[PDB]
Amino acid sequence: DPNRPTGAFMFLGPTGVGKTELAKALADFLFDDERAMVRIDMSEYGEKHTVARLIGAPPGYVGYEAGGQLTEAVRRRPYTVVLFD
Amino acid sequence: QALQKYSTDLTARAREGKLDPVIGRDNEIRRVVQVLSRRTKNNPVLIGEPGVGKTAIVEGLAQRIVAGDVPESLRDKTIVALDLGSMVAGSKYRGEFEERLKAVLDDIKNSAGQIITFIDELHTIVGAGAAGNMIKPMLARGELRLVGATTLDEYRKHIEKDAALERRFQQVYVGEPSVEDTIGILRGLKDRYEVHHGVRITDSALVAAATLSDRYITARFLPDKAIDLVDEAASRLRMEIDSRPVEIDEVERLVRRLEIEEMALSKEEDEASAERLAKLRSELADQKEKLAELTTRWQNEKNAKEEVGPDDIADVVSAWTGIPAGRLLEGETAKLLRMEDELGKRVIGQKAAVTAVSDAVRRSRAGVSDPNRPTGAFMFLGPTGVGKTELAKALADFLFDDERAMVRIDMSEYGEKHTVARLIGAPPGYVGYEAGGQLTEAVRRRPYTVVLFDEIEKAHPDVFDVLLQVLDEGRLTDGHGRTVDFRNTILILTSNLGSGGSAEQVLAAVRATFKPEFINRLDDVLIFEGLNPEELVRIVDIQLAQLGKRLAQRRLQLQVSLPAKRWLAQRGFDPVYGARPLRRLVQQAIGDQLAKMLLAGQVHDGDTVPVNVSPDADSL
Amino acid sequence: VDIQLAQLGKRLAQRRLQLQVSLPAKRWLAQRGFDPVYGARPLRRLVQQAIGDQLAKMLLAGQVHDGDTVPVNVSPDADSL
Amino acid sequence: RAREGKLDPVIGRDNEIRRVVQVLSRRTKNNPVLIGEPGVGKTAIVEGLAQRIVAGDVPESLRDKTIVALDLGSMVAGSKYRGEFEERLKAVLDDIKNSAGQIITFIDELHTIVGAGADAGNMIKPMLARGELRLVGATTLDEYRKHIEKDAALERRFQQVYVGEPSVEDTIGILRGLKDRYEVHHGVRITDSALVAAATLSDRYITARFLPDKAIDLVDEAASRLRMEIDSRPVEIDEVERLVRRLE
Amino acid sequence: EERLKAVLDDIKNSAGQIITFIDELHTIVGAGATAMDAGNMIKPMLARGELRLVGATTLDEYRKHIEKDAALERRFQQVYVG
């Protein structure tokens, strides 16, 4: 489908099985360096007002030129895999 | 002539070999060229994070044109580089800056297709008026070539706000090279630093200065975060091959200073300092000995280095960043084998935990532990007052020689969700934003410290999920977006879980209070035992020595009897409160009588009071 | 276990100290850390604690200097280098 | 200033000064920046290096070089017109480059270099990365990450030098060296048993401030008070008289 | 900055006589803003003790305005008035 991510799905299960090594292995053979994966952790986003952490803050506030954290990585060079820890 | 006046040539500089070799990066140079020789929109702009090489690419294009390695319509172009600073200077009248810009633009127009205007820090054109906008008409006519270079974020901070401009440029992405390409660039740049100084540079050095500045300095980018080590090691070696090498230039300046001290301290008409002089002489002599020995060894080496080897780079990586990554110069390897007996001078028993704490330090000095994970992170737990916080302070002193130099946070205050922003900073645009985090901003600089979380189970089980990505991955991101790395710290968690069960209750309570994916990340989860009646005499003498050192500021050293020590280690023992009862007993028994005897005269300074056993109390 | 040992060799190939592990050794390892409640991380923990501990004990006590290859073998309980 | 003997003796801190030297004497990007908490001694290091040059302990690449103390405040003094400040700074930069490296510009409180604009403190960015002007700067630890680290294009041209605070044993020596400069200004004498106490005592009572600075104040205040007592009557004979002349 | 430099120069030209006195000196921090430049031009002269500057501020506008500037608090000695 041309209007949807090229793939978006979830795996889950017990710990120490490989549900992270699998994503790392995937990012390693498409970009040839494992550093080229966007990895954000959803354990720091336990508050409501942390939605503006990966979106940026509105104009006229303190942290404004800093831009987002998830959007500013996919705006420039969108081809990666984004991991939602 | 205005071009002769304001800007400065670049090809003229390239012709005289004033620029450096530009090894690699041919793809981007070809891309620049094919964008530069297009029909419309012939304005490339270089975009990338600082240090990756962006002026280097224009220097390379200059070398290429001068040598003659370009396609047809790029022969003898004479790249020119503007200078807005000198353009707006002394133009204190109303129509001068725009006039000078007019003259420059006309002189660029007259040359049909030769000149290539080149602006570095392109973003500095958006202002410059009081203007700086009399360029959109020209770009609309393709008259200007305007090769430009800026960084990734000043772009959207000063240009993307003016999308009438951002249309007229084509972005070229400049990603940082890998370690191989870094080795390549260094293998070509070596020759010029070998000439500036007078030293030799092995190839193992050009390998290390890239593979090392990639694991440690995680804040800059490859092509220069790897050159700076070499350019420092060269200068250090030059200094050494000149007047006396270092490690003699320290003991000389130290022996001299100790001498200047002792030859003016002796003439103190006092008795208090008479014991502060009976040690200065001792250490001055013990260092004179070492200076003599080393200066003699210098003769053996001179009769029986001259290039920056592979470990001078490591010495620079250690002087920077504080992290010790050296070669274990034969004096440390003795400390690393006496580690256990040196800790045992401050902690007693719990050897099953001492062996585990210590083994994870030699395991990283020998370069055997995993390079992307903390240096070792494990949790202590056991009954109260047993040693499980004294051990962390004894370990943080064996490594830095000052107990106060560990980052320590008390987890008995992080009792709610929102108190996580206490150690991570605040999200963008809020009250405390210029202050950053509290755990972060002390491990973002000097990342060799030791992290201590007391009473981890007193927290709220959502602080536990920051340490998830702290452990077993070694990094976390504060509010500002920066990513600090914990790949060299030693995390330590203390607790008091169970405290009543032999060995099953503690594990059951741990499994009930923590997550499996949290107990699975740590190294061994040690258990402390609990002191035995035998193991308290070795604490009694410790406490008495400490107290004597305290009341040694008035020369009032005690003189304790062996029956006294045995009574003292038999009275306070109860096996439910650990070893604090012993301290309170020492106070209540000795210090009270001593303080009542001290301020009631009769124990004036310079005295040595003995203590001895009376039937129940112990009289002085 | 094979992937772990290969990565470990590639790591301590920076001092040219290639290793030599036996099939009974790899079987002893793959049998030791298996418990089906934590997954595979206990394997990395055991690898470190059982090999790297001894190796780093010796490496700074001389006798295992660069350019060398030390073999491992199963002993009754541990596996001596 | 260091030639005429106008600077205080600098003691210890060998490693910091040797690293300042071996950074200040490289091919490109030869400009250090001292960093660390306020009070631990960061202008003391530059003054020590200057006295060291005047004496001649420095290597050949630095023998006979003068250190000039740039003053950014006195440059924006009168510059109300649209280009005068840029003209001034350009003349200064051209004159620095006109010499052959016989000058080492030293900017104190360099976090103030970001402004001056209204495109300022930015025309220095080319000459920095080439090593023309040798810059020695020193700002505290937390205005760095507030004004400089926000501008990763400019903080790339700086090599950080961390300056940790000394210990009690070292502070004792620093005081042993500095005593004879207060012994003169105040007409008094200072006892070594007091120099040890002003450093052991000011390490468990005043925790809001850092080392030597929080240990030199005690010595200086004690001497000034003793001189006051020397001139007039002693204390506890002065207040008893002041309140008596009031109860009357 | 011109006026500030003039006043500082005329304080320095005197033989250490003048004893300046800034009442409620918690207003000296952001003297002239635009980018930190002004109000800390006196920071080199405080250390050498050229100008004396006895000042006085309330107890909770000293940790709301100054203590946030730990580099400048260092040059001041506190006299607690109970």
Ligand SMILES: Nc1ncnc2c1ncn2[C@@H]1O[C@H](COP(=O)(O)OP(=O)(O)OP(O)(O)=S)[C@@H](O)[C@H]1O
């Ligand atoms: N099938 C597997 N393939 C590759 N590596 C594996 C596999 N199973 C386990 N591992 C390794 O064991 C560790 C498990 O890594 P992870 O994938 O993060 O664990 P996990 O399965 O994600 O469990 P959690 O919930 O994330 S703690 C890593 O060191 C992996 O390399």
Ligand SMILES: Nc1ncnc2c1ncn2[C@@H]1O[C@H](COP(=O)(O)OP(=O)(O)OP(O)(O)=S)[C@@H](O)[C@H]1O
């Ligand atoms: N391919 C290369 N060949 C030779 N030197 C290089 C190469 N890439 C980078 N360098 C060096 O690395 C440094 C990069 O300098 P510049 O490219 O001018 O800085 P930049 O990459 O433009 O980023 P900024 O924003 O200008 S600091 C210089 O010392 C270059 O000589």
Ligand SMILES: Nc1ncnc2c1ncn2[C@@H]1O[C@H](COP(=O)(O)OP(=O)(O)OP(O)(O)=S)[C@@H](O)[C@H]1O
């Ligand atoms: N093995 C020991 N060796 C030396 N001193 C010890 C030892 N165990 C306890 N102490 C003394 O006990 C005090 C420190 O006890 P801690 O271990 O810090 O208490 P704790 O282990 O943190 O237990 P809790 O539950 O955290 S109060 C100091 O006075 C030490 O001198």
Ligand SMILES: Nc1ncnc2c1ncn2[C@@H]1O[C@H](COP(=O)(O)OP(=O)(O)OP(O)(O)=S)[C@@H](O)[C@H]1O
């Ligand atoms: N190594 C040293 N030897 C002698 N005196 C020293 C030494 N270090 C510091 N001092 C003295 O202690 C004081 C420290 O003041 P400075 O170092 O000039 O201030 P600072 O350390 O630069 O802090 P900031 O950041 O400038 S506010 C001065 O009186 C110095 O003379």
